[PDB]
């Protein structure tokens, strides 16, 4: 059993590939969560931005099961996101400075620690700092939210392109 983009837990407008590892956005922000979530320990997954045409954008990260599928990631209390445009961090629809932007060809890294809890983002194997600490308790799922026709690919592991050497984690694939 593999960790994949959930067929049951997605916005209908998103275009999910047959292998359930690739996703294309459609118009206004909408979301897909993975098939498996985490409750304790340190976990990791990667996202590759395959194509990001002009005006398109992504908000990538982690969402609890109640995260609104018809809204960007970071919209409500249930999720925490990292935006392609300006590297902004979002939670409860509040954008805060975090990193510089990301786009086409970039490999983004997603770390979560649920012991003080932490959310950490990586860009091409570079730790971008602690985006959020002492997060809302519950189960967290790898999550993708896309604005317009951009294409992203999710890698749950075990083999990452840029595996972090700075922190201990299990790949999301260990959930499978």
């Amino acid at each position: 059993s593999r960790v994949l983009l959930a067929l049951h837990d997605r916005a209908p407008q998103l275009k999910i590939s047959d292998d359930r590892l690739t996703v294309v956005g459609e118009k206004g922000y909408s979301m897909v969560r993975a098939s498996h979530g985490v409750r304790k320990g340190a976990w990791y997954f990667e996202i590759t931005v395959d194509e990001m045409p002009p005006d398109t954008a992504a908000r990538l990260g982690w969402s609890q099961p109640l995260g609104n599928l018809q809204a960007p990631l970071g919209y409500d209390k249930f999720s925490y996101s990292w935006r392609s445009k300006k590297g902004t961090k979002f939670h409860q629809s509040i954008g805060k400075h975090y990193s510089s932007g990301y786009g086409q060809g970039d490999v983004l890294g997603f770390y979560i620690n649920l012991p003080g809890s932490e959310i950490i983002f990586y860009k091409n194997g570079v730790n971008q700092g602690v985006a959020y600490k002492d997060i809302f308790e519950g189960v967290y799922f790898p999550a993708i939210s896309l604005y317009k026709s951009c294409t992203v690919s999710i890698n749950f592991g075990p083999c990452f392109k840029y595996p972090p050497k700075d922190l201990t984690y299990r790949p999301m694939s260990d959930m499978g």
């Binding site: 922000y29 960007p72 919209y75 445009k85 979002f90 629809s93 509040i94």
Partner: peptide, 12 residues
């Protein structure tokens, strides 16, 4: 005519 923006749901 208004079209949905990337920052549609954002407060800040």
């Amino acid at each position: 005519e208004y079209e949905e923006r990337e920052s549609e749901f954002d407060i800040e």
